[PDB]
Amino acid sequence: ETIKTDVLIVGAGPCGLFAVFELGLLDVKAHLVDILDKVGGQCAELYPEKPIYDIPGIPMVTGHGLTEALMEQIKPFNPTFHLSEMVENVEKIGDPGFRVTTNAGKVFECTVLVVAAGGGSFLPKRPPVPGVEAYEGTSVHYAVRKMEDFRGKDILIVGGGDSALDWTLNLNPIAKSMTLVHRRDDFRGAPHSVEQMRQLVASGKLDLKIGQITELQGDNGQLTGATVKLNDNTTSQIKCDAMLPFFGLTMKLGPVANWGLDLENNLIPVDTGTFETNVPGIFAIGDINTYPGKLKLILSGFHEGALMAQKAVKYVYPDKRVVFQYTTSSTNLQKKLGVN
Amino acid sequence: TETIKTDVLIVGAGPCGLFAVFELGLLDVKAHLVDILDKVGGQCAELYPEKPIYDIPGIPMVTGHGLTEALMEQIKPFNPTFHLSEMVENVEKIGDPGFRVTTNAGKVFECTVLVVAAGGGSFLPKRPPVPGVEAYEGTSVHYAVRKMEDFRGKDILIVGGGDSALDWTLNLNPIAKSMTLVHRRDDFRGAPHSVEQMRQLVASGKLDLKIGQITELQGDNGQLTGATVKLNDNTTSQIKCDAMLPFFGLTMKLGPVANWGLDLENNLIPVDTGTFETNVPGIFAIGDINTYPGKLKLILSGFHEGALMAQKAVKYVYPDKRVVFQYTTSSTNLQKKLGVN
Ligand SMILES: Cc1cc2nc3c(=O)[nH]c(=O)nc-3n(C[C@H](O)[C@H](O)[C@H](O)COP(=O)(O)OP(=O)(O)OC[C@H]3O[C@@H](n4cnc5c(N)ncnc54)[C@H](O)[C@@H]3O)c2cc1C
Numbered sequence A: 001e002t003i004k005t006d007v008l009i010v011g012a013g014p015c016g017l018f019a020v021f022e023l024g025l026l027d028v029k030a031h032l033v034d035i036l037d038k039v040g041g042q043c044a045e046l047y048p049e050k051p052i053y054d055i056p057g058i059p060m061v062t063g064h065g066l067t068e069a070l071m072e073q074i075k076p077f078n079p080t081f082h083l084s085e086m087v088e089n090v091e092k093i094g095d096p097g098f099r100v101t102t103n104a105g106k107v108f109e110c111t112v113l114v115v116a117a118g119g120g121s122f123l124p125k126r127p128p129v130p131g132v133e134a135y136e137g138t139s140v141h142y143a144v145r146k147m148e149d150f151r152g153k154d155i156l157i158v159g160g161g162d163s164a165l166d167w168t169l170n171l172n173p174i175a176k177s178m179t180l181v182h183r184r185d186d187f188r189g190a191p192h193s194v195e196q197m198r199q200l201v202a203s204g205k206l207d208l209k210i211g212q213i214t215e216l217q218g219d220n221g222q223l224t225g226a227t228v229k230l231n232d233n234t235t236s237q238i239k240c241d242a243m244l245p246f247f248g249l250t251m252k253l254g255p256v257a258n259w260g261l262d263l264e265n266n267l268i269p270v271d272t273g274t275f276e277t278n279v280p281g282i283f284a285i286g287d288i289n290t291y292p293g294k295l296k297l298i299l300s301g302f303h304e305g306a307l308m309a310q311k312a313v314k315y316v317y318p319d320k321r322v323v324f325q326y327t328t329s330s331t332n333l334q335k336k337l338g339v340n
Numbered sequence B: 001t002e003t004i005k006t007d008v009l010i011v012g013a014g015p016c017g018l019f020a021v022f023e024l025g026l027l028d029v030k031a032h033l034v035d036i037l038d039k040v041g042g043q044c045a046e047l048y049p050e051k052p053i054y055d056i057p058g059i060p061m062v063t064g065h066g067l068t069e070a071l072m073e074q075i076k077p078f079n080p081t082f083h084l085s086e087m088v089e090n091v092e093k094i095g096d097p098g099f100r101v102t103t104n105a106g107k108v109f110e111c112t113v114l115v116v117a118a119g120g121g122s123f124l125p126k127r128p129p130v131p132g133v134e135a136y137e138g139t140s141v142h143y144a145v146r147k148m149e150d151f152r153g154k155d156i157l158i159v160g161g162g163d164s165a166l167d168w169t170l171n172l173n174p175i176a177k178s179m180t181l182v183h184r185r186d187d188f189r190g191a192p193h194s195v196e197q198m199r200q201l202v203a204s205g206k207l208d209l210k211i212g213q214i215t216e217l218q219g220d221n222g223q224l225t226g227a228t229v230k231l232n233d234n235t236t237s238q239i240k241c242d243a244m245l246p247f248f249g250l251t252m253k254l255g256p257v258a259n260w261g262l263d264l265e266n267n268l269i270p271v272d273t274g275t276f277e278t279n280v281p282g283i284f285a286i287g288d289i290n291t292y293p294g295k296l297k298l299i300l301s302g303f304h305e306g307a308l309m310a311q312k313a314v315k316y317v318y319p320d321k322r323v324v325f326q327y328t329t330s331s332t333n334l335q336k337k338l339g340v341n
């Protein structure tokens, strides 16, 4: 059956997470969906280890620390997360009400939709090697679902983080041959992955080429080889049936484009009092939105979530009059927070 | 005498006034802050220092005092100048923009930009119900100390039972001719060191204590000579006093914000939602003093407001500065301003 919820939030970046808090203070429950395999969006994917200095009231917190703190704060409302899943279509079916379907065919029905999509859908980054589009699907792969597909062929893996290293090690001894290429001979993922890999190099079972891929060989989108340029300005050929780039993730607008929102420069325009869109029952908070003076700051997304929540309750509970209470002095609110 | 020149003058040192120092500082805009309270932090610090707050984004739980202390950390790298126990009384436009701003103690500021972060209003001494709406107020009923020489060898009536009342009894007792303290209950809830030095004064014959409420005052020409207290037995009793000092605590009134020609709406300053500027270019309003469609009296909104205000205020302070949006996390320029090395 379809999963029914008061609110569906697209994204579990900082601004999507905090929205759980503000919606929870008003007894509005939420499911969140993110194509990333972790909560925290950009903070968690792009700068987890790095210090942030402009979260009001925290002199310094890390990307990861912030993520972990927001998860604490929202833990008392019982949000339901669906990670590694992509929101694809939205269809208006109530006044308001929305049917929202994920890439794995999961279906939600919610009263209110909150777009917290941020910079966009995180997706595998395309490596910067001319003519790349063509081999995509056939012989350039950004994921391994069935590893049996790669037995006894020549594999080019490009990259040098955990995913690259995991796939090199797992796809040997399946492979006929393989050539790992990274820009530099320096690996994060240490110590265990990095050393098993260097064991494969030293044993002749893996060939390492330090550099970057400058062109590809193959007709009808089927690979046969690749040119690498090494760090001595020398080129060299590689034999490969398959190239698997692991250059990390990147953010593209994605499905937000296909939901009949009146975008402006790939941003959703929004009322400055309620952070609602053009479509009643659809809100947008965080870096996905726009309004005069908008700033892509975490702290703004917070404000935006708080004001959105005020509007979204009136759709979820229309007969109920909202009485403004403070978290510090209201025991009703403290009861919702699980403070005795 | 000489006017204090600054880029920005901030009215209030509540959470939202304090955070505005941060956002102005990321853009090399310096600030003076002025509050009539004797401490930073506004409501969080005066009304709920020891209470837990749960809706500061990213902090599961912080206290009124903890938040105040955390904000003072965050803004420390920019070197704000505070003027506490002082009140902003008048503002006058003198540039395009530019303001001359004078405090109740005749201090004068000249600033390019004014940021009203007045919150719930100025904190002020509450009237006791004597009726105390009084003849005596200019001259022998005082809500604050002038200089302490004013009270040498005077008979002093102090009414109240919190820290202030107790601080003034103890500080004025060595010089007073005589002193009576009156509070409605024989229970003192302020800091227990004060409470006990006070009871030392009672027990030593240096202080008269009377438990009850003042019902009547004695004196023509607005000059006190005594007072009637009703004790909790409906019994009355007479007190000799040249001066009555009520310390019933603080309360927030709109105050001087009403006298600056701003177009108010329900005692709130209307404001552009993109810049948090007012009707008067160069004057901004952030925090609980403001209004706009959707406004919520939340700390976290005042933060947003301060950030967007800063963006506009820099164009006045540095009109040839082209502003570039950078992140604290990734920009070494910003990290240089923060004193991260
Ligand atoms: C290097 C760097 C440093 C930064 N430093 C600062 C700083 O100091 N201060 C500051 O305030 N800000 C900073 N930012 C900005 C901050 O990262 C963003 O403001 C914040 O991430 C926005 O949060 P959000 O919740 O709106 O969305 P994001 O963090 O962008 O997360 C949105 C999530 O939505 C997902 N998504 C989008 N569409 C879909 C879909 N259809 N289905 C499923 N999932 C979807 C994405 O996978 C993503 O996880 C920085 C950004 C970067 C890159």
Ligand SMILES: Cc1cc2nc3c(=O)[nH]c(=O)nc-3n(C[C@H](O)[C@H](O)[C@H](O)COP(=O)(O)OP(=O)(O)OC[C@H]3O[C@@H](n4cnc5c(N)ncnc54)[C@H](O)[C@@H]3O)c2cc1C
Pocket: A326, A327, A328, A329, B011, B012, B013, B014, B015, B016, B017, B018, B034, B035, B036, B037, B041, B042, B043, B044, B047, B048, B053, B054, B055, B056, B086, B087, B088, B089, B117, B118, B119, B120, B121, B122, B123, B255, B256, B257, B286, B287, B288, B289, B297, B298, B299, B300, B302
């Ligand atoms: C009991 C209680 C619980 C609360 N709980 C919460 C909560 O859980 N979460 C939340 O977000 N908010 C809460 N708030 C609200 C929060 O305290 C306010 O939104 C916040 O204090 C606004 O701060 P601000 O900087 O705008 O001004 P304030 O804290 O109002 O600071 C204003 C300061 O300005 C000064 N001032 C005004 N005019 C002048 C003048 N002319 N000259 C000099 N000084 C002047 C005042 O003396 C005061 O110190 C609570 C409030 C109360 C009373």
